[PDB]
Design a protein around this ligand. Structure first.
Ligand SMILES: CC[C@H]1OC(=O)/C=C/[C@H](C)[C@@H](O[C@@H]2O[C@H](C)C[C@H](N(C)C)[C@H]2O)[C@@H](C)C[C@@H](C)C(=O)/C=C/[C@H]2O[C@@H]2[C@]1(O)CO[C@@H]1O[C@H](C)[C@@H](O)[C@@H](OC)[C@H]1OC
Ligand SMILES: [Mg+2]
Ligand SMILES: [Mg+2]
Ligand SMILES: [Mg+2]
Ligand SMILES: [Mg+2]
Ligand SMILES: [Mg+2]
Ligand SMILES: [Mg+2]
Ligand SMILES: [Mg+2]
Ligand SMILES: [Mg+2]
Ligand SMILES: [Mg+2]
Ligand SMILES: [Mg+2]
Ligand SMILES: [Mg+2]
Ligand SMILES: [Mg+2]
Ligand SMILES: [Mg+2]
Ligand SMILES: [Mg+2]
Ligand SMILES: [Mg+2]
Ligand SMILES: [Mg+2]
Ligand SMILES: [Mg+2]
Ligand SMILES: [Mg+2]
Ligand SMILES: [Mg+2]
Ligand SMILES: [Mg+2]
Ligand SMILES: [Mg+2]
Ligand SMILES: [Mg+2]
Ligand SMILES: [Mg+2]
Ligand SMILES: [Mg+2]
Ligand SMILES: [Mg+2]
Ligand SMILES: [Mg+2]
Ligand SMILES: [Mg+2]
Ligand SMILES: [Mg+2]
Ligand SMILES: [Mg+2]
Ligand SMILES: [Mg+2]
Ligand SMILES: [Mg+2]
Ligand SMILES: [Mg+2]
Ligand SMILES: [Mg+2]
Ligand SMILES: [Mg+2]
Ligand SMILES: [Mg+2]
Ligand SMILES: [Mg+2]
Ligand SMILES: [Mg+2]
Ligand SMILES: [Mg+2]
Ligand SMILES: [Mg+2]
Ligand SMILES: [Mg+2]
Ligand SMILES: [Mg+2]
Ligand SMILES: [Mg+2]
Ligand SMILES: [Mg+2]
Ligand SMILES: [Mg+2]
Ligand SMILES: [Mg+2]
Ligand SMILES: [Mg+2]
Ligand SMILES: [Mg+2]
Ligand SMILES: [Mg+2]
Ligand SMILES: [Mg+2]
Ligand SMILES: [Mg+2]
Ligand SMILES: [Mg+2]
Ligand SMILES: [Mg+2]
Ligand SMILES: [Mg+2]
Ligand SMILES: [Mg+2]
Ligand SMILES: [Mg+2]
Ligand SMILES: [Mg+2]
Ligand SMILES: [Mg+2]
Ligand SMILES: [Mg+2]
Ligand SMILES: [Mg+2]
Ligand SMILES: [Mg+2]
Ligand SMILES: [Mg+2]
Ligand SMILES: [Mg+2]
Ligand SMILES: [Mg+2]
Ligand SMILES: [Mg+2]
Ligand SMILES: [Mg+2]
Ligand SMILES: [Mg+2]
Ligand SMILES: [Mg+2]
Ligand SMILES: [Mg+2]
Ligand SMILES: [Mg+2]
Ligand SMILES: [Mg+2]
Ligand SMILES: [Mg+2]
Ligand SMILES: [Mg+2]
Ligand SMILES: [Mg+2]
Ligand SMILES: [Mg+2]
Ligand SMILES: [Mg+2]
Ligand SMILES: [Mg+2]
Ligand SMILES: [Mg+2]
Ligand SMILES: [Mg+2]
Ligand SMILES: [Mg+2]
Ligand SMILES: [Mg+2]
Ligand SMILES: [Mg+2]
Ligand SMILES: [Mg+2]
Ligand SMILES: [Mg+2]
Ligand SMILES: [Mg+2]
Ligand SMILES: [Mg+2]
Ligand SMILES: [Mg+2]
Ligand SMILES: [Mg+2]
Ligand SMILES: [Mg+2]
Ligand SMILES: [Mg+2]
Ligand SMILES: [Mg+2]
Ligand SMILES: [Mg+2]
Ligand SMILES: [Mg+2]
Ligand SMILES: [Mg+2]
Ligand SMILES: [Mg+2]
Ligand SMILES: [Mg+2]
Ligand SMILES: [Mg+2]
Ligand SMILES: [Mg+2]
Ligand SMILES: [Mg+2]
Ligand SMILES: [Mg+2]
Ligand SMILES: [Mg+2]
Ligand SMILES: [Mg+2]
Ligand SMILES: [Mg+2]
Ligand SMILES: [Mg+2]
Ligand SMILES: [Mg+2]
Ligand SMILES: [Mg+2]
Ligand SMILES: [Mg+2]
Ligand SMILES: [Mg+2]
Lengths: 58, 134, 113, 206, 116
RNA sequence: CCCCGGGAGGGGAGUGAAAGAGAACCUGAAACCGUGGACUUACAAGCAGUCAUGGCACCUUAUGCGUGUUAUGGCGUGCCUA
RNA sequence: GGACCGAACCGGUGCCUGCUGAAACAGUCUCGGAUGAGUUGUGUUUAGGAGUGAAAAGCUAACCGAACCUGGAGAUAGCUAG
RNA sequence: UGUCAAUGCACUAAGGCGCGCGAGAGAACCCUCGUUAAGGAACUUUGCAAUCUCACCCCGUAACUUCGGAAGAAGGGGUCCCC
RNA sequence: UGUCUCAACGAGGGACUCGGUGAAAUUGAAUUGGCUGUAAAGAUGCGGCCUACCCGUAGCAGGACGAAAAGACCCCGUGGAG
RNA sequence: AGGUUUGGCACCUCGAUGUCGGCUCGUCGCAUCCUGGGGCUGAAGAAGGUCCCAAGGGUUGGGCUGUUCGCCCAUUAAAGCGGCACGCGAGCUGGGUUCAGAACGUCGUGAGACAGUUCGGUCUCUAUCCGCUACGGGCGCAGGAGAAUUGAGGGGAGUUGCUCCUAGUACGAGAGGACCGGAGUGAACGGACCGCUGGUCUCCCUGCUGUCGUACCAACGGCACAUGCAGGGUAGCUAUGUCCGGAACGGAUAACCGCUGAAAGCAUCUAAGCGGGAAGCCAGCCCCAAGAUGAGUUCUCCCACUGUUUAUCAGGUAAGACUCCCGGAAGACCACCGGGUUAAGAGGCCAGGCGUGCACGCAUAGCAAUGUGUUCAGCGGACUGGUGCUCAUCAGUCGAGGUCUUGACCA
């Protein structure tokens, strides 16, 4: 079979024990200064296309 | 960097054409003759070091036949030998000179240049026989 | 961790190094005589000379060096001189060479005429 | 005893009476006395000296008031020196004498996660005759059940470099005092532009 | 280890690294601006900047140099007689990048690179 | 019929005793996965329980009465087969 | 010409790699034969103590000192489990 | 197309494809590779493995032999462009 | 001639990080340390003493008499077959 | 006495505890091979013998053999003996013996056999827990922050030769030939470093072949590897290359050597007491370290905000961080360091350095292959500065109001 193999099934507790580290981070979203929608920082406001002026269509 | 197994050329008329080294010693010529060794572990022969060696090839009409074990001092490394001013030397082929247990050469003469470092380690007669102490 | 002093380490190195830098006749891969001093023979200051082809030049400042290759009694020899080594008197251009590459080690295994 | 701070500038070729000398150039730029540690107040004797300057726009208020109480411009770097009792500010001038031996402390260049051959000189297995242990790969780590653990302090793959390091009894070749340059024989730990401490040779010779 | 670096392997061999940077320089020059992965844009920036600086010399040598990398004759023509001359009094900085969020399929973040 | 959705899915409206039957259509146990809440745990050695006591919480076979949880002390070598 | 070198083709020498494989026998490299006791297609004949076999107890539909399927048959089990 | 020849090798025509996860990073270690100072089998059970050799011309070629052979023995030289 | 003294540097494909899809063998249950001692005679789990805050990620293979096949050796069966 | 040999016995393991040797990696005992200290000697010196103390470190490279051993070569201060499942196969070999083939010798009428001998012969990508090496996240450390730090404790290190001075002295008829102290130079080992000497440097520069292409020529690009081949080669990384190290001093000890000294009117190192005394012990050297929950110390910063008995603790903020962006001699991720417009962080651009080695184009010489000039040219990854040309926009998240007791000082 499979040289290394695990010994006892891991506990419902210890399994969720390891998982205390998989929580996602929410984006630090910010209010776009022209389109009045939300945008990622140091990127281009998807809603209006603006980046001080305006680079992308729509 | 001579080490055991590596074959040298002989710079004397002692009658060997070329030896193969089999040990690497410490080799103070030292008023009573050659010293006893300076530790059993040294790995590499440099210019000026003494080595033990089998005589793998020899002159017909020799003073020194094939298969003699012998002690030769090394006088030409392909390895760079650096010096106190900054300069380096290096010869196209490695070569040695067979010598007796008081250090003196066994041939009547040396052949090719010899490193100035032989003069450093008090190898008087080898230095004296050689055409150029480079 | 590392200091961030505003500093031209270029010129700090240059000041040090220029105190021990020395300029020589302009050779360039064709042969010459290096006349030089062996204080090394006793307390006396013997002189000796190496005439050979220049097969490379390396570095700059303190570190610049050049490489001569000759033949002495059958066995080939090469030597490496720092331009600023005190054990070097004068170089002089014996000859001028029509070589075609900066380094020209091909003469290691050419040895002939 | 004597101490000072500087940046590692590089290594070059030199001469002194026809001996070629590798040297490391160091900037022992003038250091300021930010703090004085009496035993009577801080329980032991020492001096807090600073090194690389930085503009007060980058210096937060607590560090600002630290430097300010001592009357000094802000310094990117601070360190203590045990048993020093300098005066005024600690310039490399005369603090080292030409030809002194000195303890040079620096920080090893960071080599990341090295294997066993790089890290501990293992010399792992043969490259032919038939393995899949060719590279590093230590051989054993124990001996069957006999204690049945692997020893504490075992030598193993790890983070190599980035260590503090001291190299003792390097010689002081030269001192260009007005430049605040100190020329020292041989190598010093860590990469160019890094911090280094020169102090009086701790293991002074007999 | 890696304490001095020319850029990136991307995940490609010496031959490709080149063929890419060449093609992408060709497209940004033909097209004024293009979007691609933020990486490949950061890698593109200096190749194309230097290319325009080569063509900025005008003589046949600089054109043949540019021909070494931009193997499409019209783009080389445009860069030689149109774009480089325009960049006359501009000391580098011929190029800019701005980043435009993340892609669906591989969840990679694209950005645009465009002539200045 | 209406709402969000490309859809899938759902929320209303309406039929029906019932949609706590809606077509993944009687009941719908357990393992197994989740949400919320009580009491709790980051100096700690453990067949996981058991006895004892304090703390906290709740009162529908239920205010001396417990029930749930918990801290600390004592004690304590899974089951079966062979 | 049971001659030589060597592609196709037939093969399988040594090493590595693969070893819950890309693959229940393989891949790259290397290597043997390569006008012959040669290679290969279609049709067809020989089988279970039986066939075949330049001979290993090999092969006989992916594990042959006696194939598979069904049946006697819930064989018998001084043995182990429960 | 090139190369004594060729269905060989290299690039390519017609034609067909980039192998149905992708992007970065440039640690240990593992696979498949390139180079390597001085030394040259000291490795090891064994030169296992990997080098070295390499095509075609020319000269040259041993013991031994069933007189065919050993033999591509061994070894040395040439090889490009132009008139 | 990197087989070796004695290993270095570089390449690519993995290994690592992010987004998509997502197995396996194994698993009495686990709140699963070291020494020494004792125990069916090689102790995480008994005794004494030491050490030790909670939880992960990349890695190594000494233990878990690690995993796989109700040992092919050996003996036994008034077992079998060639 | 030990428990490392051959054995007895048969206790766990036959629903498996893989066995010889090598390699790799270690670590322990001491009944000590070397070094260190001592007694005695049939110890003059030197060279030894043997016993006592001592386990810090050290203990070589080859030939033969599967070998372990052992013999040999050539060295050595020495080439120690054993434990650790005869340590170590989920770490590697697979040479050895325990499968199938085949052969010899032998035994058996045979099928087959072995104390044997010989050629051949599948060693299983994914670590759950513990143990180990590295790296983060959390909470704690009675306010919230930025730095500097004591060192409880813990780790590393620890070898040794040769020569020279003492001194041709003490000693010895002589030959010979010292201790003690003082210098110097090596080996092996380790740490750091890249100036030197070198390695490499997968597209930094050049040369070269075939073939395909940019119409052609000239000039270039692709493929020939995952660099087509070759010749060089900066930064980086690197050893074979450099530099540094092992200690000095000190405290308590071992064998042992003594002072003072009774019992025991003498003697006695011991019975009270005291000094000397090792590579060993403690400290000294380097590194780690307050999760030393016994959580330490010092300098500095910010300060008493707000909400009706209803939401009772939370919420705007300070000092200060963090997200994000551009980078790094930092790095798997994380972490760490630097910059982010009151800006030289990176790219680019300029200048320089360094590498390659004389560009294209034109002219010219020549029948031509080519040569020469223009030209130390041309081109240029990672190197040193400068420079606001590009991007480091704009912004969002988070973060104090300091429990109680007792004692002293204060108004
Ligand atoms: C590694 C290759 C194969 O294993 C072995 O050879 C051997 C594995 C073990 C070590 C061995 O155990 C040992 O037995 C001893 C008697 C006792 C010993 N004790 C002391 C522990 C024990 O350790 C065996 C009997 C264990 C048992 C589970 C078993 O029978 C396993 C069978 C097969 O899966 C394995 C393979 O991995 C399959 O590899 C195949 O190789 C072919 C060439 C390929 O074509 C391919 O076939 C399509 C591939 O797959 C099938
Ligand atoms: Mg040339
Ligand atoms: Mg680093
Ligand atoms: Mg190796
Ligand atoms: Mg094991
Ligand atoms: Mg244990
Ligand atoms: Mg990838
Ligand atoms: Mg367009
Ligand atoms: Mg330019
Ligand atoms: Mg609808
Ligand atoms: Mg619907
Ligand atoms: Mg419902
Ligand atoms: Mg229902
Ligand atoms: Mg269902
Ligand atoms: Mg439905
Ligand atoms: Mg439905
Ligand atoms: Mg019904
Ligand atoms: Mg139902
Ligand atoms: Mg909640
Ligand atoms: Mg809950
Ligand atoms: Mg607690
Ligand atoms: Mg309890
Ligand atoms: Mg034939
Ligand atoms: Mg066959
Ligand atoms: Mg085939
Ligand atoms: Mg053949
Ligand atoms: Mg044949
Ligand atoms: Mg029959
Ligand atoms: Mg079959
Ligand atoms: Mg089938
Ligand atoms: Mg059968
Ligand atoms: Mg039955
Ligand atoms: Mg019947
Ligand atoms: Mg029966
Ligand atoms: Mg043809
Ligand atoms: Mg072909
Ligand atoms: Mg098709
Ligand atoms: Mg070279
Ligand atoms: Mg040879
Ligand atoms: Mg050997
Ligand atoms: Mg051998
Ligand atoms: Mg042998
Ligand atoms: Mg071979
Ligand atoms: Mg004859
Ligand atoms: Mg003949
Ligand atoms: Mg023959
Ligand atoms: Mg023949
Ligand atoms: Mg590497
Ligand atoms: Mg790689
Ligand atoms: Mg625990
Ligand atoms: Mg007991
Ligand atoms: Mg025990
Ligand atoms: Mg218990
Ligand atoms: Mg216990
Ligand atoms: Mg603790
Ligand atoms: Mg593993
Ligand atoms: Mg098992
Ligand atoms: Mg059984
Ligand atoms: Mg029977
Ligand atoms: Mg026994
Ligand atoms: Mg009995
Ligand atoms: Mg079992
Ligand atoms: Mg056995
Ligand atoms: Mg003893
Ligand atoms: Mg003694
Ligand atoms: Mg004596
Ligand atoms: Mg030996
Ligand atoms: Mg031999
Ligand atoms: Mg041992
Ligand atoms: Mg035994
Ligand atoms: Mg064993
Ligand atoms: Mg195994
Ligand atoms: Mg075998
Ligand atoms: Mg017979
Ligand atoms: Mg074979
Ligand atoms: Mg074999
Ligand atoms: Mg895999
Ligand atoms: Mg405070
Ligand atoms: Mg301490
Ligand atoms: Mg502790
Ligand atoms: Mg004298
Ligand atoms: Mg005198
Ligand atoms: Mg006398
Ligand atoms: Mg002395
Ligand atoms: Mg070293
Ligand atoms: Mg090192
Ligand atoms: Mg270099
Ligand atoms: Mg190239
Ligand atoms: Mg070409
Ligand atoms: Mg042309
Ligand atoms: Mg093509
Ligand atoms: Mg092609
Ligand atoms: Mg190259
Ligand atoms: Mg007395
Ligand atoms: Mg005493
Ligand atoms: Mg004392
Ligand atoms: Mg010592
Ligand atoms: Mg407290
Ligand atoms: Mg609050
Ligand atoms: Mg603020
Ligand atoms: Mg930062
Ligand atoms: Mg910052
Ligand atoms: Mg701006
Ligand atoms: Mg700068
Ligand atoms: Mg400015
Ligand atoms: Mg330039
Ligand atoms: Mg003409
Ligand atoms: Mg280019």
């Amino acid at each position: 079979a499979k040289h290394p193999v695990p010994k006892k099934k891991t506990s419902k507790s210890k399994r969720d024990m390891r998982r205390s580290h998989h929580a996602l981070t929410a984006p630090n979203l910010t209010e776009c200064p022209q389109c009045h929608g939300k945008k990622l920082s140091h990127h281009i406001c998807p809603n209006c296309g603006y980046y001080d002026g305006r680079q992308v269509l729509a | 960097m001579i080490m055991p197994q590596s074959r040298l050329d002989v710079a004397d008329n002692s009658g060997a054409r070329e030896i193969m080294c089999i040990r690497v010693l410490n080799s103070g010529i030292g008023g009573k003759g050659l010293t006893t060794g300076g530790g059993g572990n040294k790995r590499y022969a440099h210019v000026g070091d003494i080595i033990v060696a089998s005589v793998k090839d020899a002159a017909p009409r020799g003073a020194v036949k094939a298969g003699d074990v012998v002690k030769a001092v090394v006088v030409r490394t392909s390895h760079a030998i650096k010096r106190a001013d900054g300069s380096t030397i290096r010869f196209d082929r490695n070569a040695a000179v067979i010598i007796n247990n008081q250090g003196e050469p066994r041939g009547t003469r040396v052949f090719g240049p010899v490193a100035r470092e032989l003069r450093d380690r008090r190898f008087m007669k080898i230095v004296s026989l050689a055409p150029e102490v480079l | 961790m590392q200091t961030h002093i505003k500093i031209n380490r270029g010129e700090l190195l240059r000041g040090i190094e220029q105190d021990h830098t020395r300029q020589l006749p302009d050779f360039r891969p064709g042969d010459t005589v290096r006349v030089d001093t062996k204080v090394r023979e006793g307390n006396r200051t013997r002189s000796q000379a190496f005439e050979g082809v220049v097969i490379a030049i390396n570095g700059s400042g303190s570190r610049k060096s050049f490489t001569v290759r000759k033949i002495s009694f059958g066995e080939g020899v090469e030597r490496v001189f720092p331009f600023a080594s005190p054990l070097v008197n004068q170089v002089t251009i014996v000859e001028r060479g029509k070589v075609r590459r900066a380094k020209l080690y091909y003469l290691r295994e050419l040895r002939g005429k | 005893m004597k101490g000072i701070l500087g940046t590692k500038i590089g290594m070059t070729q030199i001469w002194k009476n026809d001996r070629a000398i590798p040297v490391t150039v160091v900037l022992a730029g003038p250091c300021p006395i930010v703090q004085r540690k009496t035993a009577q107040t801080d329980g032991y004797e020492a001096v807090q000296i600073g090194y690389a300057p930085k503009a007060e726009r980058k210096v937060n208020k607590p560090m600002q008031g630290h430097f300010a109480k001592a009357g000094v411009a802000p310094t990117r770097i601070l360190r203590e020196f045990r048993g020093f009792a300098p005066d005024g500010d600690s310039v490399n001038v005369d603090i080292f004498a030409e030809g002194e031996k000195i303890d040079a402390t620096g920080t090893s260049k960071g080599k990341g996660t090295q294997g066993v051959m790089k890290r501990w000189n293992f010399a792992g297995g043969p490259a032919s005759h038939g393995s899949k242990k060719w590279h590093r790969r230590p051989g054993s780590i124990g001996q069957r059940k006999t204690p049945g653990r692997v020893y504490k302090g075992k030598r193993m793959a790890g983070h190599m470099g980035m260590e503090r390091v001291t190299v003792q009894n390097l010689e002081v070749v030269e001192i260009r005092a007005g430049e605040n340059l100190i020329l020292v024989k041989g190598a010093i730990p860590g990469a160019n532009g890094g911090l280094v401490v020169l102090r009086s040779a701790a293991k002074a010779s007999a | 280890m890696r304490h001095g670096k020319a850029g990136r392997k991307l995940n490609r061999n010496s031959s490709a690294r080149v063929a890419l940077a060449r093609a992408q320089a060709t497209a940004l020059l033909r097209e004024g601006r293009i979007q691609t992965t933020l990486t490949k844009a950061k890698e593109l920036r200096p190749f194309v900047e230097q290319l325009i600086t080569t063509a900025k010399g005008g003589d046949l040598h600089s054109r043949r140099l540019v021909a070494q990398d931009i193997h499409d004759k019209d783009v080389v023509r445009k860069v030689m007689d149109e774009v480089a001359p325009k960049y006359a009094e501009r000391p580098g900085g011929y190029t800019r990048i701005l980043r435009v969020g993340t892609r669906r399929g591989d969840g990679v973040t694209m950005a645009l690179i465009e002539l200045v």
